[model samples]
Target: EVPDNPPNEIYATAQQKLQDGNWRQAITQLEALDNRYPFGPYSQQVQLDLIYAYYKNADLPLAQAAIDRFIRLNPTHPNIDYVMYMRGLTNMALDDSALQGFFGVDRSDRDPQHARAAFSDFSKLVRGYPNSQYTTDATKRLVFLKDRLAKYEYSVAEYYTERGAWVAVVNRVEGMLRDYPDTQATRDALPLMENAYRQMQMNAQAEKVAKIIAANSS
Candidate 1:
């Protein structure tokens, strides 16, 4: 059986392109190499290098797709941790869209769908590879994710409060406090909850949250 893409210097060409910082050239060369040599000697390296090249060039969505492909193809591959780390990083990077993370929009106004995925990815990475070189950074990102998630929940609870969804406000705030407490998001979350209880004439609960906020602030 003969392999295709004749002349077979794909790895050499791709490596040189990468060395020259020609990510586009490297991607083109490796793409052909992948097509012709699906399981060739350099196949794994091709996938890894391709992901790195895409990431460097800020083609984050494509980088995400490439990394997912690599994980499925090489489940027990040696560099699995780093691959997972990159996946989380890409998801985290994408979550910072201006509409979601900045300008006039409130933090509690969006669902943070991608941020949740990023948090899950980083959490899995840490649980699965406790001492990997990337673990520390992943851990730090996890904290940030938690805070973002808390803020997301705050926005949701505020929405419920506005519509007189008293039970929803309580449930949402309670969950955020339990799952994502001690963050700046939770700082205002308390008052938001307090107001909801007050609106509903639930003084007992209002005092409960007000006291906690007071204790924490002091």
Candidate 2:
């Protein structure tokens, strides 16, 4: 009597298709495998690979759906950190989509929005799993996100300066310095904010901000 189990050959084929960039085929094969052998050992692996394939192909919604399914089915799995990390990356991808028109360019060029979302996700991951293997990578990504956010604030401050909105410029620059002191943008913003304050006839505030910037410089 033969066991009622299908061979694992389909998983190998699916992986091959994924490597060949035939993601649609990989997805089809994985879906069929999952449907036919709902509790197979390869189910989780195939699902995770499917998510990666969808993401590589820029199918954001499909990638997110695959992650959702994996999380729902395997919340307590030992590899849950990887699942959470992937979900965070997917959310960052979606946030990029949201800012498509805001930056006067396509979604691909709008990285700050995605970085901010990724930062949010990485922050959550760090808070929940401080000892997870993803911590090092997440920390690096958070640094990048903070830099982008600081740059964005500086850009807004520049715009306000160009429009002669001195108070708005000061506010934006001050916010950047206070919130993202580690960023290059914040380092460059201090002098600009001081100038704005001086131009606005706020001499005392200008001198105060200048002292603060000098103190931080040392």
Candidate 3:
């Protein structure tokens, strides 16, 4: 049946802990609530609140797990998009290096390795729910993420160009131009493409990139 008369007031207790910014205390109460009810009322809400609490405490893995559960369980829920947004934010936080407190790195999950996954999460949110309340921030985040990915590609291209790997350098720079156009990195990337083309003696392609480069500069 229903929880013990409003879940015996445990939700408010959890709310108080959340309000007090006691992440662990909120987790205790919320997790208990989850146990007591199993198929509880306010289940979706509890998951959302618990997810936020986990994040506030820098428990990204837990937050991700809870978010996934919510997504699977509440497919058509009005707030489901928020769960998608949280997944992106969680992965972003997990992968960021500047925020070391929230960063628990793995070899497989370190830095650029995880960036695409985070970007993909945000991409899903925007494409799947363009009308979501989170869409604006998600769009901004996607741009920044794309720039980072592009810059990484540019770095690899620069390395190849320096080493005289004209074909390799051109391939990488071209991928960046193709994949991350309109980013800050894309502008800088044009020069690399021109230089690689010239190095390879592809005179016409070099001229074409030079025009694009000139157009951007002037």
Candidate ranking under TM-score, highest first, comes to 3, 1, 2
Residue 77 of model 2 has an lDDT of: 65
Q: Candidate 1: TM-score?
A: 0.84
Q: TM-score for each prediction?
A: 0.84, 0.79, 0.86
Which prediction has more favorable TM-score, 2 or 3? 3
Model 3 alpha-carbon drift over 4 Å, by segment: 1-8, 99-110
lDDT of 2: 0.72
lDDT of 1 by residue, 73-166 (tens): 7878766577777778788876665654445765534566767778877887787677789889899999878887887787788888887788
Question: Which lDDT tens digits does candidate 3 get at residues 1-218?
Answer: 22444564777877777888987888777777776864777878888888878988888889888888788768777666787788888887777555454565323223565567779878888987789999898889888787777777877887888888888888887898888777655667677777777877776797898888778775
Best by TM-score: 3
Model 1 score (lDDT): 0.76
For residues 93-128, write the lDDT of model 2, one tens digit per residue. 666555447667634324575566677767766765
Against the unseen true structure, what C-alpha lDDT does each candidate score?
A: 0.76, 0.72, 0.76
